Design a protein that fits this description.
Number of strands: 18
Distance between the termini: 39 Å
Strand content: 15-25%
Family: Belongs to the type-B carboxylesterase/lipase family.
Protein name: Bile salt-activated lipase
EC number: 3.1.1.13, 3.1.1.3, 3.1.1.6
Subcellular location: Secreted
Helix content: 25-40%
InterPro entries: AB_hydrolase_fold, CarbesteraseB, Carboxylesterase_B_AS, Carboxylesterase_B_CS, Neuroligin/BSAL
Number of helices: 16
Radius of gyration: 23 Å
Length: 532
């Protein structure tokens, strides 16, 4: 069986059908379906006008404007609000009531086909679920804000919400169950997933959610001072910074490609960690995000939730702050480490920096090797940027959850990157190739253990999407994943060895204690994509 032309709110769409076996199995692939009219710079998205005939949804549309780490040219196009769908099909009849997984992924900066992480075929077919990938506005075009009416901000979030509302209204025609939507995404997408479940705008739309290395409680997920950054990029492009209204009007009119290129990620030595410069992110606009995310968990009370991080999630970032971490030739001193912590602890000044340098150097047993120091730098950023906020998000979700499940994991499959050190664990986004089944899609570049991890991850993910329990659904699982409880703080460690010892307890509880107890008590003084 195969869908023909599917009716959507704006008209008919037609994709392609890829035969998967002699059994008559296949997968219906739709690419380039608009979920909104091409967006006006810095304005909320609107419904796409109706069209006659059949929209040929046979190829990926350009994604929104973004740039690479070199930041010399832009990629994408402003006209980018399109989505893609994969519908696994059986023999007798087209699929119906299938779980719907919406992948939220996108960033202002890419480091490395470009639609590698936008193809949901492996996931949809191995897990028997519908996968929807789409594009949303990123960087300044997606998140510029003046902190007021002149430019409320959160455009990329509105775009995501638009895609979600569209899937809710139209996925049934594709064979999906509108009441079984699972949002999943990593990094900014992960924080986005979190933010979407917390926004009152998504009431009744989301069933479950998966945050991979990113939650709305992450420090880098909410910009506390958007006006400061709005003014900076504005002045950089020749706009009036005198009054917000005129500045906003100018930003809406300036060249989108120049505006995009004006968003710089300083790779040269800086006083603050790189993450400080990834300023164009969501803001508490009192609308889409009506309050600080931590106070919005009642909105996700009935949303099943899986949130997790990677072994060395912070490696990618700290390696930009301290490049010597990756070099076996160059060394790192206690000074370099103190400088790193001070930059990360500005809010609590010298005391905060001292308390932090102390705790993280305690395990050095005053005779630390280079590998030890570099590993500690990675742990520091992994903790602050991902582990800790995820731990409290998971905890907050469990505590407020009503009829919703809460699970947490630690992805620790060691990096295969030759450039990085031998002791390297799972870096930021390393989980993606497994979640997206690349060891199967593109086998020749992978080993048996990679297929094992991928199989396990897609299984857990798609099972969760179907039942709200990673253990049950369309796939068998290599290990029992127990739901997270506050008392036990249990998590599944995902890697090539999934066995009886896979469920672990209390991950870095001492560090969680430091940050939430010690640190917070101190007085306040002052092909991967990153950023929102």
């Amino acid at each position: 069986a195969k869908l023909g032309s599917v009716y959507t709110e704006g008209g008919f769409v037609e994709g392609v059908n890829k035969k998967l076996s002699l059994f008559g199995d296949s997968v219906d692939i739709f690419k380039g379906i608009p979920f909104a009219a091409a967006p006006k710079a810095l304005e909320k998205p609107e419904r796409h006008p109706g069209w006659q005939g059949t929209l040929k949804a046979k190829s990926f549309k350009k994604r929104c404007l973004q740039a690479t780490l070199t930041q010399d040219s832009t990629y994408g196009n402003e006209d980018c609000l399109y989505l893609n769908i994969w519908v696994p099909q059986g023999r007798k009849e087209v699929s119906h009531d299938l779980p719907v997984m919406i992948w939220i992924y996108g960033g202002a900066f890419l480091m490395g086909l470009s639609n590698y992480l936008y193809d949901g075929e492996e996931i949809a077919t191995r897990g028997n679920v519908i996968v929807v990938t789409f594009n949303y506005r990123v960087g300044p075009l997606g998140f510029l804000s003046t902190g007021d009416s002149n430019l409320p901000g959160n455009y990329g979030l509105w775009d995501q919400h638009m895609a979600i509302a569209w899937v809710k209204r139209n996925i049934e025609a594709f064979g999906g169950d509108p009441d079984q939507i699972t949002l999943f995404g990593e990094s900014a997408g992960g924080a986005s997933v979190s933010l979407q479940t917390l926004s009152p705008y998504n009431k009744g739309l989301i069933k479950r959610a998966i945050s991979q290395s990113g939650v709305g409680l992450c420090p880098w997920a909410i910009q506390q001072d958007p006006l400061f950054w709005a003014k900076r990029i504005a002045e950089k492009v020749g706009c009036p910074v005198d009054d917000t209204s005129k500045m906003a009007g100018c930003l809406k009119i300036t060249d989108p490609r120049a505006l995009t290129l004006a968003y710089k990620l300083p790779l040269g030595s800086t006083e603050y960690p790189k993450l400080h410069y990834l300023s164009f992110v969501p803001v508490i606009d009192g609308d889409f995000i009506p309050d600080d995310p931590v106070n919005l968990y009642a909105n996700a009370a009935d949303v099943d939730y899986i949130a997790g991080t990677n072994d060395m999630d912070g490696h990618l970032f700290v390696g930009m702050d301290v490049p010597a971490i990756n070099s076996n030739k160059q060394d790192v001193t206690e000074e370099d480490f103190y400088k790193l912590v001070s930059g990360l602890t500005v809010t609590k000044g010298l005391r905060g920096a001292q308390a932090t340098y102390e705790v993280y150097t305690e395990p050095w047993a005053q005779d630390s090797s280079q590998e030890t120091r570099k590993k500690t730098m990675v742990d520091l950023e992994t903790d602050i940027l991902f582990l800790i906020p995820t731990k409290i998000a998971v905890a907050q979700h469990k505590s407020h959850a009503k009829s919703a499940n809460t699970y947490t994991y630690l992805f620790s499959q060691p990096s295969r990157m030759p450039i990085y050190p031998k002791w390297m664990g799972a870096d930021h986004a390393d989980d993606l190739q497994y979640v997206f089944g690349k060891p199967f899609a593109t086998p020749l570049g992978y080993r048996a253990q990679d297929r094992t991890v991928s199989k396990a991850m897609i299984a857990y993910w798609t099972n969760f999407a179907r039942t709200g329990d990673p253990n049950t659904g369309h796939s068998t699982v290599p290990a029992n994943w127990d739901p997270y409880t506050l008392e036990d703080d249990n998590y599944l460690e995902i890697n090539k060895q999934m066995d009886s010892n896979s469920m672990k307890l209390h991950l870095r509880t001492n560090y969680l204690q430091f940050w939430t107890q010690t640190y917070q008590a101190l007085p306040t003084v002052t092909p991967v994509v990153i950023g929102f």
